[PDB]
Design a protein around this ligand. Structure first.
Ligand SMILES: *Cc1c(COP(=O)(O)O)cnc(C)c1O
Ligand SMILES: *Cc1c(COP(=O)(O)O)cnc(C)c1O
Lengths: 388, 388
C-alpha cells in the first residue's frame, strides 16, 4: 500500500490565454504550439535528425553565420550562458565581463563558480560601453574571453557590437555575445561582426516555447575547446559531445542525452515562420512597433528608462513608474481586465519601471495599440489623479 | 540585406505516429501531449506556481516521500544526475559508484569533471550488487555519497535497494539513486528505503515529454548542501536556488531561470494519470505485461540478457540477437511495416541485444501482444532460415 495520491491532481488543468507583452516569454503561434503535439521521437530516429538539421539551417539564418558548430543546448537561456563559460574557460583563465545589467551579473556568478579569474568593468545601466572603454579594458586585462549582453531585457538597452570582435581578435580574445533579447528584433551578423560564441532564447523574439537554447560557436572558439588542458566541468553541455550528436563534426553521432523532441519541433516551426517572412521584414516590423509605442508613451507623459532613442532595444522598453504610482496595482488591473501582461522591473529597473516586450505573436501594430489602450485604462482606473 | 533563408524550412513539419516500445522515449497520451499546447506562462504567474505545486505533490506520490525539497531540474535525466553530483560533492570528496551499466559510467565521468575522488566497484552487467559487496565497499572507501542505478535501461537489470540506505547512514554516507527507468514500473519507497537523492525520467515509464527531470532530496542531503565550503559549480541547477523558486523552503521565491511551462503542464497531466489509476495498479499492469513478454519470447526460442527472472527490470528487457541475425534489418522492417520501434542495444547490450520497453502508453497486454507479433513477423520476413 502507498500513501494516497494528492487531491490537487483531481481537477482538470486550466491555463488561460494571456496577451504576453512583457520582455519574455512571448506568445507562440498556434502552429508553433501544436508542433509540440507530435510524437516524441527516439534519439536516432531519421525524422528527429532531419528536424535537427532544419533547425541548424534556421539557426545559421537568424544568427547570420556559416558556423558548423551551430546547435542547441538542452536548457533555458541560462544553460546557453553556462555552456559558453564552462567550455571556453579553464580554472584560472581570465574572463572580462562588461557589467551594466543583470545578465552580466549572472555571467560573473557563473564564471566564478567555474573558477575563472573574473575581470569586470562597470557602466551605467542606461548607456552602452564605447569601443574605447572596451578596447582599454581588453588591453589592460588580456582576457581569454569577453562577454557582452547585446540587448538587455532588464533595462531596454542595446549594445553596439560593430568593431568589438576585431579588437578581441587583435588580443587573442574570444568574443561571446548574449543575443537572447535582441535576435530577430534588430540586425545581427555573427560572422561579419567577428563574434565567436552566441546564444538566443526560444521564448523571446522567436515566439518558441522555453527550455531549449540555440547556440553557435566559431571555428576559433571550437579550436579553443578542442585544445583545453582539462575536461570541461559539465558533461551535459560539453560542446564536443553535444556538437557530435547534433552532427556538427566529421564524426559519427553518439548518444549524449535525450533531446526535447517536442521543443525541437516547435523551435523548427518558429524558425520556418521567420524564414517565410524574412529577417529584414521582421526587424522592420518590430522597429515600427517600437516607434508606435514610444509615441503613445510620450502622449501619456511617461518616461522611458533608456532616454536616448539611439540606445534603445526595440523589443524591450522600460516605462518609468511616475511618482504617485503603485506599479503592481496597474499590472494586476491590466491582467484582470484585459488579460494583458504588464511586467514589472528587473535588475536596473527593479521598482523603477514596467517592461514592455515586442516579441513573438504580439509584434504587430494592433497589438501595440491594444497595449497602449489597456495600459492607459489600467493606470487611469487605478490612479484617478494621474494626469495625461 | 541578409544571406537568404534555408529552403529546408519551406516544407511543412511531418512527424509520423510510431509505436514507441523501446526503453525510451515512450508514447505520451493525447491528454499529456495536448497539455503542452497551453499558454507559456510568466515565471511569477499564479497558475504556473499552482501547477508546479501539483507537480511536487504528484512527485512525492510517485517517489513515496514527504521531502519538501521535491522539485524539477530543467534538463533531461542526465541533468538530474549532474545536479545530484554537483550539489552533493565538493572538490576532493569521495564518491562511491557501483558500476555495472552505462549510467554509472556517466556518473563516473561527471564526478571526475566536478573534481571528486571517484571510487568504483565493478560488477557483471546482468547481476545486481549484494548488500555485502556494497557494505564492504562503503567500509573500505568511507564515501560522502554512494551512487546506484535502480533500473538499468542498458541491461534490463533491477538493483535491490532494501537495506542500502541504512548501511550508508551508519557510515555518514548519502544514498543517491537513479530511478529513471524503474519508477512507476516497480515498487519504490524513497523514505522507507532511507534514500537521500533520487531522480526519474519524464519520457520513460511516466509517458511525459522529455526535457524536464523530477528530483527529490532528503533533509539530510539538503543540510549537506547548506553546509558546503564552496559554491556548487553550476548555478543553473544549484538546488538551494532552484528549490527556492519551486517553493521548497521557508523563503520567498526569487527568479532563477525560465522553466519550461509547456513541459510542466505535460508532466502534471502524466502525474494526474498515474494518480487516477494508482501506483499499485500501474506496477501490477507492467509486471503482467513483462510476464506476457517473457512467455512470448520463450516460445520464439529467444534469450533474455538478464537470465534470472528474479533480477529483471519489468520495463526494459534485452532480447539477445541469435547467431545468424542482423539486428538492424529486423528493426527497420519492424518500423517500415508495423511502425514498431524495436530498439537496439546500449552499453552492456550494444551489438548483443534489442531492448523492449514497457512504458507510457504501451503498457498494455494488447500492445505487448502486438509487439510480439510485429517482432516475430519482422524476424521471419527478414531471416527466413530462423527457426522458432
Ligand atoms: C534513459 C536513462 C537515462 C538517460 O536520460 P536522458 O533523458 O536520456 O538524459 C538515465 N538513467 C537511466 C536509468 C535511463 O534509463
Ligand atoms: C530573459 C533573458 C535571459 C534569461 O533566459 P532564461 O530563458 O530565462 O533562462 C538571458 N539573457 C537575456 C538577454 C534575456 O533577456
Amino acid at each position: 500500500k502507498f500513501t494516497p495520491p494528492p487531491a490537487s491532481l483531481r481537477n482538470p488543468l486550466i491555463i488561460p490565454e494571456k496577451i504576453m507583452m512583457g520582455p519574455g516569454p512571448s506568445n507562440c503561434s498556434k502552429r508553433v504550439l501544436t508542433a509540440m503535439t507530435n510524437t516524441v521521437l527516439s534519439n536516432f530516429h531519421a525524422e528527429l535528425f532531419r528536424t535537427m538539421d532544419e533547425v541548424k539551417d534556421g539557426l545559421r539564418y537568424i544568427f547570420q553565420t556559416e558556423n558548423r558548430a551551430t546547435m542547441c543546448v538542452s536548457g533555458s537561456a541560462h544553460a546557453g550562458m553556462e555552456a559558453m563559460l564552462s567550455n571556453l574557460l579553464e580554472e584560472g583563465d581570465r574572463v572580462l565581463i562588461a557589467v551594466n545589467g543583470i545578465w552580466a551579473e549572472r555571467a560573473v556568478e557563473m564564471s566564478e563558480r567555474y573558477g575563472a579569474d573574473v575581470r569586470t568593468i562597470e557602466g551605467p545601466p542606461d548607456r552602452p560601453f564605447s569601443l574605447e572603454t572596451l578596447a582599454r579594458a581588453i588591453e589592460l586585462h588580456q582576457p581569454k574571453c569577453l562577454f557582452l549582453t547585446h540587448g538587455d531585457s532588464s533595462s531596454g538597452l542595446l549594445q553596439p557590437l560593430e568593431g568589438v570582435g576585431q579588437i578581441c581578435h587583435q588580443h587573442d580574445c574570444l568574443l561571446i555575445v548574449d543575443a537572447v533579447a535582441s535576435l530577430c528584433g534588430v540586425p545581427f551578423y555573427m560572422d561579419k561582426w567577428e563574434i565567436d560564441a552566441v546564444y538566443t532564447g526560444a521564448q523571446k523574439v522567436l515566439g518558441a516555447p522555453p527550455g531549449i537554447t540555440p547556440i553557435s560557436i566559431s571555428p576559433k572558439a571550437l579550436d579553443v575547446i578542442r585544445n583545453r588542458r582539462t575536461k570541461s566541468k559539465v558533461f551535459y553541455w560539453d560542446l564536443l559531445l553535444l556538437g557530435n550528436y547534433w552532427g556538427c563534426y566529421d564524426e559519427p553521432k553518439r548518444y549524449h542525452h535525450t533531446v526535447a523532441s517536442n521543443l525541437i519541433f516547435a523551435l523548427r516551426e518558429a524558425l520556418a515562420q521567420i524564414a517565410e517572412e524574412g529577417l529584414e521584414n521582421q526587424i522592420k516590423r518590430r522597429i515600427e512597433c517600437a516607434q508606435i509605442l514610444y509615441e503613445g508613451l510620450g502622449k501619456m507623459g511617461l518616461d522611458i528608462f533608456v532616454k536616448d532613442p539611439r540606445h534603445r532595444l526595440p523589443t524591450v522598453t522600460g516605462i518609468m513608474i511616475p511618482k504617485g504610482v503603485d506599479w503592481w496595482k496597474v499590472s494586476q488591473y491590466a491582467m484582470n481586465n484585459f488579460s494583458l501582461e504588464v511586467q514589472g522591473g528587473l535588475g536596473p529597473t527593479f521598482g523603477k519601471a514596467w517592461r514592455v516586450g515586442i516579441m513573438g505573436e504580439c509584434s504587430t501594430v494592433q497589438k501595440i495599440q491594444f497595449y497602449l489602450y489597456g495600459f492607459k485604462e489600467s493606470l487611469k482606473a487605478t490612479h484617478p489623479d494621474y494626469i495625461f
